[PDB]
Design a protein around this ligand. Structure first.
Ligand code: S3T
Length: 466
């Protein structure tokens, strides 16, 4: 029909081939279920309408099916639309030195070229505003973007070119508050500045929880949604594609293993009871601060193979502290049912539990195919990417919740530099922790031996009331 005849031919332009069962599948604006990358690019910059939901989802998840350099080449290719030849009558007009009517050329420029080109510029703008890290990780990509943007000509394009340049410059500059005063910083045995004495029992439990909550809040807020797409944190380029997520994972591993280390390396039973009791008090302050990430880190340490088996230690833990620990565990049961109910009911600020998102994204990545087949052709399963983007969107709704708590730089550095494993690998260190657990509390027939004290300071906690 004339609709396809008005569009450019497939021999000079790839984004005008008609829709079909073997290049695009759908789930007012239709929702894309699957398609070839060309059809995804076409609909990302569609001439009939804007689609901000799709633009946001595509730019969050495209690195799982298209490289940044390839996306830029494709949207530049999309932008470069050939114009139709003059009609026979207008050819005669041009050869006679007269102005052609150019009715179809003008209609095509207004109803197709200008909308598609403005839609490409809108993708460029969203890309530099929300995903500038692609340009920080690849200077050549930015050079190509600035060259493309800098050569765009048009009255209607001018405003778009300036906003894109403004955002890029604002991002380069960034690379190079509270209504009330925060509470008084709490000290226990260790004095301010005496970093050498800082430890689990010498720092105030309230302040350990406050400083770990600020540390974890900052780590949570730094994770970008694309660090979780396509399971890139479990792949080779994880250090470049997921630096903030890996920093959050490594913190959780170091903090959890440090709590286990403090517990099993305290051989004296009475002292180990004081250590465990202090870690439950730290969990109590994490609850008060709505740091669910911190609460579930303590749960993980208490449920670990070396700690969970310490029946002689938990026997001496007051019933009230055991019930607090049991209810924190129940946050994880029934697929984190109670945890999600608590998160949706609390008032900000909070630090959500990050692990649940990683688990659910891995389940979505492993349980859904990368491509869908239709008539022998492979289409990118975009609904899979949309589901991952919806989960990462849940992460983002809590990333603008700063805490009215004063940073204590020395305590902050103490927790940033925690290295319980030392030179050991994780598996070998956890085997050491379990073998250490068998040493301090041997299995049933072997009796419980007595061990000497290691702390030359009082074990009584100052409590959790500020
Ligand atoms: C079926 O498996 C489990 C059920 C649990 N049920 C409850 C209610 N709490 C648990 N753990 C909490 C955090 C806790 C309380 C007291 C002492 C210690 N050490 C840990 C559980 C751990 C389990 O497995 C590891």
């Amino acid at each position: 029909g004339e609709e396809q005849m008005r569009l450019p031919s497939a021999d000079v332009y790839r984004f005008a081939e008609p829709d079909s069962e073997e290049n695009i599948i759908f789930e007012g604006i239709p929702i894309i279920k699957a398609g070839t990358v060309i059809k995804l690019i076409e609909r990302l910059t569609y001439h009939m309408y804007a689609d901000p939901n799709f633009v946001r989802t595509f730019l969050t998840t495209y690195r799982s099916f298209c490289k940044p350099q390839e996306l830029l080449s494709l949207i530049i290719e999309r932008f470069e639309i050939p114009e139709p030849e003059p009609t026979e009558a207008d050819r005669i007009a041009i050869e006679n030195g007269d102005q052609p009517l150019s009715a179809e050329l003008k209609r095509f420029r207004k109803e197709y070229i200008q909308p598609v080109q403005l839609r490409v510029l809108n993708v460029c703008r969203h890309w530099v505003e929300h995903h500038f890290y692609d340009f920080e990780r690849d200077a050549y990509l930015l050079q190509r973007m600035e060259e493309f943007i800098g050569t765009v000509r048009g009255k209607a394009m001018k405003k778009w070119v300036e906003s894109i340049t403004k955002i890029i410059q604002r991002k380069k500059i960034a690379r190079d508050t509270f209504q009330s005063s925060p509470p008084t910083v709490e000290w226990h045995i260790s004095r301010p500045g005496h970093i050498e004495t800082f430890d689990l029992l010498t720092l105030h439990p309230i302040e350990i929880a406050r400083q770990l909550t600020l540390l974890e809040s900052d780590l949570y807020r730094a994770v970008q949604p694309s660090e979780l797409v396509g399971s890139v944190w479990t792949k080779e380029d994880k250090e470049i594609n997921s630096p903030n997520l890996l920093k959050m994972i490594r913190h959780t591993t170091n903090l959890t293993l440090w709590f286990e280390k403090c517990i099993v390396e305290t051989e004296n039973l009475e002292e180990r009871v004081a250590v465990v009791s202090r870690i439950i008090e730290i969990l109590q302050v994490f609850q008060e601060l709505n740091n669910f990430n911190g609460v579930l880190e303590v749960v993980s340490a208490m449920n670990s193979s070396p700690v969970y088996r310490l029946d002689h230690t938990f026997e001496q833990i007051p019933s009230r502290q055991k019930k607090i620990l049991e209810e924190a565990h129940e946050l994880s049961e029934d697929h984190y049912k109670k945890y999600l109910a608590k998160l949706r009911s609390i008032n900000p600020p909070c630090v959500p539990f990050f692990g649940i998102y990683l688990t659910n994204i891995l389940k979505t990545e492993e349980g859904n195919p990368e491509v869908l087949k239709r008539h022998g052709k492979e289409l990118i399963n975009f609904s899979k990417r949309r589901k991952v983007a919806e989960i990462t969107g849940e992460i983002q709704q809590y990333q603008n919740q700063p805490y009215c708590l004063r940073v204590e730089s020395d305590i902050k550095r103490f927790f940033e530099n925690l290295n319980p494993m030392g030179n050991s690998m994780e598996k070998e260190f956890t085997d050491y922790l379990f073998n250490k657990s068998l040493e301090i509390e041997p299995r049933n027939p072997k009796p419980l031996p007595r061990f000497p004290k290691k702390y030359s300071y009082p074990l009584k906690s100052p409590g959790v009331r500020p």
